[PDB]
Amino acid sequence: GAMAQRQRALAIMCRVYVGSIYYELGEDTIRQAFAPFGPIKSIDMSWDSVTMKHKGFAFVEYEVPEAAQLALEQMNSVMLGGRNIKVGRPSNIGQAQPIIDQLAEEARAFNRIYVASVHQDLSDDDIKSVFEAFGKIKSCTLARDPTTGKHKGYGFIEYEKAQSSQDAVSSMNLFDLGGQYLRVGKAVTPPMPLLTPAT
């Protein structure tokens, strides 16, 4: 089976479109701006001319669509500079909508919350401080990063109750770690390798 897209819907959902790029920021800056969200897997960049004035557009692909979701929900709603960027491609929406709503509802069965903008040193049990002070958690693990050596700036925390999950989301954004406010959301696709057949 050539061309491993593994459900084209999810493949694109993990990759956000960045339009209306400010000016003094490029792939160098955008990488870091969305770094607390998810690890940059690949970038479809449009460098125009040797001048490097990035005349065009860019695509930021993450390892997890949850980071892409937060990039859509928060980054497009909050001006990260003197210019608002357009995240995503409103074209195949509606067609892939039943899939999106399916994934969200399907991952909802695990009622796990998504923790991003996690401080690199601050560890899993540390993030537990805030989450477990509001409600109860059954599983807590920040994804380990092989190239960083410590852990990626995100993780998947699991509440036992859907009420407490919603309580956490409302306050966990404000989680200040050394000057940076955290960023929480939800799991949009089942972040577990429950794929028996590798088709």
Binding site: H119, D121, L122, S123, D125, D126, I127, S129, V130, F131, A133, F134, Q163, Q166, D167, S170, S171, L174, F175, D176, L177, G178, G179
Partner: protein, 31 residues
């Protein structure tokens, strides 16, 4: 009080939260 906008729970959270940041993230001296 009101949930979602928790007053005590989230302050419990953050006393722990900067405690965890005090060891790793930003040393504030003692605590």
């Amino acid at each position: 009080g009101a949930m979602g906008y928790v007053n005590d729970a989230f302050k419990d959270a953050l006393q722990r939260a900067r405690q965890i940041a005090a060891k790793i993230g930003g040393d504030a001296g003692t605590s």
